[PDB]
Every structure is written in C-alpha cells, then in structure tokens.
Amino acid sequence: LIDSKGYGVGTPMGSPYRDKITIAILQLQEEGKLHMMKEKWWRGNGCPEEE
Amino acid sequence: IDHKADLAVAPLAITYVREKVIDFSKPFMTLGISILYRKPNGTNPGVFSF
C-alpha cells in the first residue's frame, strides 16, 4: 500500500448527520456487521495460491 | 455542496481537498494505492523435463 485512506458517507458542510452516521457505523463495526457485508461481496469465485 | 442530495453512500475516499467542502463521516472501509499488474503464465514444467 502506497498510502492509507478510507471511504465515507459524506454529508454537506455543516450537516446534522456526520455524527449520527458514525455512531451508526461504529455500531455496525463493533457488532462485526461491516465484515459480514465485506465477506459477502468481496468473496469471489476462489483463486489458487497453488504453491 | 449546493445541497441537492444529502448522503454520498458510494466509494468516496476521504482526502484533504474533499474534507474542506463536504463533511465525511468516519470510515467504513480502509484503502491504499497499489499496482494491478498481470501474473506470468506460470513456468509449465513439461513431462519430459529431465
């Protein structure tokens, strides 16, 4: 990895949601629901390392 | 910016030039920049490799 950054649920400048979304994001991350959603879509058809 | 829609639920990365104009939330994935290069075609060792 060249750098490190991350996605976002970006709201307008001065919105009453950039706090209500991150309490909801961290609630989905402590419960592990952001990993059941990533293993669902980034699953793939499988790929061999082979050695 | 001109308040036409509220959320941006899409892979919209958190950068320095974007944070000044819109409010991102805290991340839900984590990124990096990396090279997508193509794999070689193995070596294919033959059955008469001796």
Place this chain on the structure above:
Amino acid sequence: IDHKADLAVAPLAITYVREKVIDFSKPFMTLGISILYRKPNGTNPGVFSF
C-alpha cells in the same frame, strides 16, 4: 467530559462507547485486535524426510 483538557493525543482507540461521550478526530493510525504469542523455537522431529 469535565473539560479538564482540550485534546487527548494518545493511543486512544475509537470505540462505540467512547464517541458517545468524547468526540474523536479522524484516525492517524490503522490497526485491529491481534494475538501475541511466543515464537516456536523447537524444530519438527522428522525422523524420516529422506
């Protein structure tokens, strides 16, 4: 909470129950919980492996 400080620049992890009281910045370091354990020092017997 009791306003005896202004920043908390520290290894202070961003959890769900901490941001309902203090109100964090946007992360300066990526991590997760992982397991520390002794490196295995002995070697496998392998009485065969000729």
